[PDB]
């Protein structure tokens with residue numbers, strides 16, 4: 016059996032310390048290893064849409080209630096109108112979002128897409144294997160519509176416990192979602208086909224139509240990885256990428272917080288409905304929560320007083336319920352706005368912002384359908400095995416001080432490589448790997464006091 | 479008699495398909511036609527400011543209720559303080575917004591501004607005709623302050639129907655806006671004066687002070703349209719632009735959703751006031767809604783049983799009202815932050831982000847005053863008549879593998895034009911406009927296996 | 942009913958909820974203890990008094 020619990024300090028991970036510099040040169044920390052990795056997000060975009068019959072929830076059509084209820088008929092109009100407006104807003108948010116989701120053009124989707132990349136996201140020509148993993152992990156009750164009601168009716172299982180068939184007692188109405196799931200799948204298949212061309216300008220209206228792998232290498236030069244490294248490691252890179260991708264099949268656990276958020280969204284909807292159901296049994300001190308009971312046990316002068324008490328508490332619950340829905344609907348709208356922005360930034364293009372997307376610079380990200388929302392995945396780049404090297408602010412001709420250069424997307428380093436006779440070398444900002452200094456890796460700059468005075472050999476300028 | 483409604487499938491537009499190709503070259507989609515167009519948005523920035531009198535709303539000078547009310551005097555104190563704080567927040571948001579609206583410097587504005595561009599937005603020196611069209615289309619009640627009180631009084635038409643005269647019955651007070659519409663007009667003209675322009679670096683210090691048309695051409699070259707095309711089509715551009723602008727006269731319709739939102743901002747304010755007014759007549763089981771009436775009809779020992787019922791329900795309505803106002807006030811503040819952000823991005827500069835602004839890349843946008851907020855218009859660039867062409871990743875000298883170039887903000891395509899003897903031609907990325915390849919449109923790059931091997935005539939490098 | 946809910950002779954176009962069918966009720970079903978029997982059987986035997 017288990018022993019005693021252990022009190023423990025919370026660990027503090029210290030940053031790697033990088034001693035500063037007090038001259039014309041400085042230590043530079045650069046990774047020598049890296050790995051792909053993935054992060055995930057869930058953004059809700061909707062609230063389930065419901066309406067409530069304002070006569071049926073309060074009473075079961077017993078006539079005495081129908082008479083008394085006329086005094087309160089205007090409250091019901093306010094209830095129905097408010098819910099109706101909330102539902103309209105949910106539909107507008109969907110239409111607005113999809114207008115930005117669609118692309119004017121896309122690649123056709125084929126099997127074997129992406130070359131050496133595994134791409135389990137490809138459609139089973141359908142939704143996707145990953146989306147189905149998510150939906151199977153979801154615990155949500157079976158839908159209605161068709162066959163709907165005849166799954167509630169006596170010709171069906173005695174074991175049904177769905178709030179969905181309780182809908183036909185309580186006066187609840189669960190509205191159908193605005194969009195057929197197949198059209199939703201079409202919208203995200205279009206996003207898959209919107210990858211490439213990712214670079215070459217903003218891409219506003221041209222479509223490069225190039226292989227997925229090629230768009231990746233372009234992105235890798237976009238983060239300061241030199242081309243020489245990329246050409247040598249192409250298969251290695253694809254393999255590391257696929258290992259990160261393969262982990263997605265194990266990502267659906269309760270320890271995955273994005274996954275957990277999906278689960279909560281599902282039970283936010285379920286919880287609201289169950290609350291209204293429980294209130295049907297809630298006597299307010301009325302002789303019974305049932306109208307028929309109080310009718311059968313009371314002389315009518317007494318009976319109506321008890322009915323009124325019952326009605327008043329029932330209406331109060333409905334009013335509180337409406338307010339609850341208005342709050343949730345608004346938060347969903349705001350969340351949907353966030354999703355829209357990420358699709359037009361984090362998904363459609365590589366971004367330099369940081370913050371957003373995965374916490375590892377940024378490379379391609381993907382999005383899939385999820386209940387009540389969109390589920391995002393971001394591929395990220397994670398540095399490792401950092402080393403410190405000597406580096407210089409720039410170089411100049413000692414004999415001609417006006418000739419000064421500085422590295423582009425990388426740093427000048429003292430060479431530590433046996434293939435380079437030159438005392439200095441160039442490496443990319445994202446990855447350690449020396450290279451000879453050439454005009455392609457540098458630009459001319461105004462002279463500065465911290466630039467090295469080179470008395471020997473520089474090829475850019477040769478003189 | 480009209481026909482029966484018709485069931486129909488929801489259409490799904492399919493993106494233009496572009497087949498992926500293997501090897502060193504690829505298919506490219508480019509528009510051959512375009513049009514200007516506009517989109518609009520309404521961002522509410524404020525809640526109308528009101529205060530109430532927990533001494534005039536509950537009862538009206540009857541001494542018996544005043545004494546009863548004293549036991550509850552602290553509730554009114556909480557009500558008054560809460561409303562007061564809400565109003566302070568509204569004034570904070572106004573000042574904060576204006577702080578970004580103002581510019582350190584601007585151009586003077588005269589009629590005929592913008593040259594061939596029509597610019598209907600110019601003031602009738604004034605507000606603007608466009609702002610006035612909006613105000614005329616809005617169904618809002620006749621304005622407060624002057625003459626005010628004398629439109630409640632018999633010195634006016636019997637046909638007045640303003641809730642504003644009911645302001646002096648209900649104890650409502652409507653606070654004046656802080657901004658003063660004349661100062662508001664000055665601020666929007668100042669934003670127009672910042673046009674021409676943002677281009678030319680940061681634009682955060684200097685003021686370019688150039689003609690409007692020039693700033694437009696600059697933006698057009700900022701989206702990959704070649705300079706040569708711009709010089710040839712200058713009148714055409716202005717014509718298409720003014721067609722899009724002319725459509726704004728039809729923009730004030732109920733199908734314009736931005737317009738619809740403006741109307742609902744007005745509607746929401748009116749509804750809140752009407753709610754409190756209707757409650758003045760709401761008995762709470764009290765014999766009458768009038769306090770003086772129940773006093774007149776009842777012996778004082780019983781009289782205040784009725785008064786008590788009435789007081790408590792009136793207080794309850796006020797409490798609910800305050801809570802609603804606090805919520806709305808907060809949503810307005812957040813909305814105002816968004817407005818401020820767009821002023822400092824969508825308006826003050828061209829943006830590369832997509833997302834924000836209308837969906838047609840981005841080109842200059844404008845903002846005008848609208849009730850309780852700002853109304854934005856976004857000019858945009860919509861592509862048309864896309865064609866498919868052959869393109870190459872880059873070019874190199876077959877005699878020397880290190881001579882490799884790639885297009886800047888454009889593509890190398892196989893020539894299809896009789897003017898160019900060269901087998902390849904440069905094009906703008908926003909429009910199909912092939913041209914000879916020259917050093918101005920290209921850059922040297924590291925070699926790659928997909929670059930074409932040109933064994934003959936390449937001018938950049940000549941050798 | 943829709944017109945009355947908006948107090949107007951011109952409701953804006955849309956899809957709107959209306960009250961549900963209350964269904965239909967059938968003839969009753971009742972179960973209660975039975976077999977009372979009033980013990981009258983002594984009259985059927987022997988000689989009456």
Ligand SMILES: *[C@@H]1O[C@H](CO)[C@@H](O[C@@H]2O[C@H](CO)[C@@H](O)[C@H](O)[C@H]2NC(C)=O)[C@H](O)[C@H]1NC(C)=O
Pocket residue numbers: 048049050399400
């Ligand atoms: C450094 O790069 C190597 C690739 O050569 C990474 O891969 C590890 O290699 C060792 C060698 O046996 C394996 O045991 C590990 O399982 C590999 N890691 C994997 C597959 O994730 C290595 O991870 C990199 N270093 C760090 C710290 O990440």
Ligand SMILES: *[C@@H]1O[C@H](CO)[C@@H](O[C@@H]2O[C@H](CO)[C@@H](O)[C@H](O)[C@H]2NC(C)=O)[C@H](O)[C@H]1NC(C)=O
Pocket residue numbers: 133135257
């Ligand atoms: C890419 O990943 C897919 C994931 O579907 C792999 O296919 C699975 O491979 C395992 C290996 O034992 C099988 O057990 C599964 O049945 C396979 N699933 C399907 C749907 O076929 C695939 O092998 C991977 N390929 C590469 C090249 O990495």
Ligand SMILES: *[C@@H]1O[C@H](CO)[C@@H](O[C@@H]2O[C@H](CO)[C@@H](O)[C@H](O)[C@H]2NC(C)=O)[C@H](O)[C@H]1NC(C)=O
Pocket residue numbers: 039413416462463464465466467468
């Ligand atoms: C070598 O030293 C520095 C670069 O390492 C060059 O810059 C000058 O440094 C002196 C300090 O002795 C400063 O006073 C000057 O202002 C620097 N020059 C400029 C333009 O700012 C120096 O020119 C180099 N060459 C020599 C000493 O011949």
Ligand SMILES: *[C@@H]1O[C@H](CO)[C@@H](O[C@@H]2O[C@H](CO)[C@@H](O)[C@H](O)[C@H]2NC(C)=O)[C@H](O)[C@H]1NC(C)=O
Pocket residue numbers: 511512862
């Ligand atoms: C580019 O397309 C536009 C519209 O698609 C063409 O504009 C014409 O505009 C007039 C004025 O409204 C219409 O009556 C014509 O029907 C339009 N023509 C067509 C073919 O739609 C414009 O001429 C085209 N420009 C080109 C092809 O260079």
Ligand SMILES: *[C@@H]1O[C@H](CO)[C@@H](O[C@@H]2O[C@H](CO)[C@@H](O)[C@H](O)[C@H]2NC(C)=O)[C@H](O)[C@H]1NC(C)=O
Pocket residue numbers: 596597598720723724
């Ligand atoms: C462009 O500006 C001109 C003014 O320079 C506008 O022309 C006026 O429009 C108003 C509105 O209908 C008319 O009452 C005036 O009579 C017009 N002026 C003249 C001289 O006829 C015009 O509406 C603006 N827009 C376009 C698209 O041309």
Ligand SMILES: *[C@@H]1O[C@H](CO)[C@@H](O[C@@H]2O[C@H](CO)[C@@H](O)[C@H](O)[C@H]2NC(C)=O)[C@H](O)[C@H]1NC(C)=O
Pocket residue numbers: 502874875876877878879925926927928929930931
């Ligand atoms: C001519 O084009 C080919 C491909 O179209 C260039 O690429 C070579 O391709 C082979 C096959 O993979 C590689 O083994 C070579 O290493 C590639 N060349 C280089 C420099 O990497 C080829 O370079 C072109 N010839 C030129 C430019 O002279």
Ligand SMILES: *[C@@H]1O[C@H](CO)[C@@H](O)[C@H](O)[C@H]1NC(C)=O
Pocket residue numbers: 036037038
């Ligand atoms: C930087 O150089 C040395 C480092 O040991 C230090 O003593 C010195 O005060 C620093 N500043 C300057 C201006 O040299």
Ligand SMILES: *[C@@H]1O[C@H](CO)[C@@H](O)[C@H](O)[C@H]1NC(C)=O
Pocket residue numbers: 130500501
């Ligand atoms: C097409 O691309 C594949 C990618 O694996 C490559 O192996 C092949 O050489 C290319 N060309 C042809 C003609 O298949």
